[PDB]
């Protein structure tokens, strides 16, 4: 029932991730109005002051977020597994939402303060995904993980879906600064709700029913660890974890391509101006969100009714969500000058990538539930490298900017995706490892 305690936590986490991603992606679409301004046959007021920022300054402003996001992944996961994930997640999203309120001031102070503000946002926000895994490690029954971790993380996709047009509408009807204030006060209200309505374990919940707490505890009974000391050497030497690391790296490289280079491909080759309606940039994330939810529910229905193994379901959904994007990404390079088919292939790739919300993205809990925060921190410290090294690759592989070099970039993305999917399918596991007991 949606009124349950675990599902209420899942809904509140959905909204938390929604708000944090809406805060993250609102700068790229509000930066256009705060700065001071041949393959296809060229298909194709405001208040406040404008800053003179070239492309390099905007790139360093936008990309400096991940340089803090990559630092507090493993420390955040460790602290979350030690003390609990509620306060870590709440205060991370609160730091993101309260630093946003100061962005109109940090901008006017200079590029230095803006880069520092984005790095502080990254530092505070890097701890939210490991904290959410370390929270579900005590809340999600083993046969309910694909549902809850899909409803929880589906906030990011709807977060972008809502942030891209709504922030533009706010910046059109009003000043550009009113984006940050609006999303910041919304994040503050969500933090006020999160502190009140959630607890980091079912035992520490003050409203949970007795039968539900007993159900959750007896389901997670035979999977929790009794070491109380993190086995770093078995974790690092475990091949089923490096399988998730390789898969997650490959998937984040492929989606960095699909969601940063492909809209740039349609601008520099198809001349499409990807939005062209405002909502065409949100449709891919919308399909991705819907597919995330539906694939989580389908994976859990499989594991519960049809008696599929956990490993078999992880393999199936990872193979789908990592070969679909690659296959539809290779074909997107052959599209010539058809902008509509390019947007269709982008949407089909981003939609089929929602299946991975029940693939490797949950396998951190299936192989080591009591240490899922540290495992997700480890797999996210590697997976945020494609988001920051990728730009160098795209800028060094397209000096002439022809269709051939873009096809080469798409081939590299697809090869990395296929290698990641095959490596995961080969070396992944779905049962709690012996070092996690």
Author numbering: 34 to 70, 81 to 87, 95 to 487
Which text from the study accompanies this structure?
Sialin adopts a classical MFS fold consisting of 12 transmembrane helices (TMs) with two pseudo-symmetric domains: N-domain (TMs 1-6) and C-domain (TMs 7-12). The Sialin structures in both the lumen-open and cytosol-open conformations reveal a solvent-accessible cavity, which forms the substrate translocation pathway, at the center of the interface between the N-domain and C-domain.
To capture the lumen-open state, we introduced a mutation on Arg168. The cryo-EM structure of the SialinR168K complex with Fab10B8 in the apo state at pH 7.5 was determined at 3.3-Å resolution and exhibits a lumen-open conformation. Dali search shows that the overall structure of SialinR168K shares a similar fold with, VGLUT2 and monocarboxylate transporter 124 (MCT1) with R.M.S.D. values of 1.2 Å and 2.4 Å. In the lumen-open state, the cytosolic end of TM8 shifts more than 12 Å towards the N-domain around the kink at Ser332 on the lumen leaflet, and the luminal end of TM7 and TM11 shifts by over 9-Å away from the N-domain. The top three positions are similar, suggesting that His298, Tyr301, and Ser411 form hydrophilic interactions with sialic acid.
